[PDB]
Amino acid sequence: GQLKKIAKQLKKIAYQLKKIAQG
């Protein structure tokens, strides 16, 4: 449960980095 919540956070964070870069 906690590692899965962390992986979901990491994926949201990677989207946010890719968006700072894009738009």
Interacting residue ranges for other proteins, rule: CB under 8 A: 1-4, 6-11, 13-18, 20-21
Place of tokens 């979901």: 8
For 5, 18, the CA distances from 15, given in Å and listed in that order, are 15, 5
Question: Shortest gap between Cβ of 12 and other proteins (angstroms)?
Answer: 9
Question: Shortest gap between Cβ of 21 and other proteins (angstroms)?
Answer: 4
Question: Shortest gap between Cβ of 22 and other proteins (angstroms)?
Answer: 8
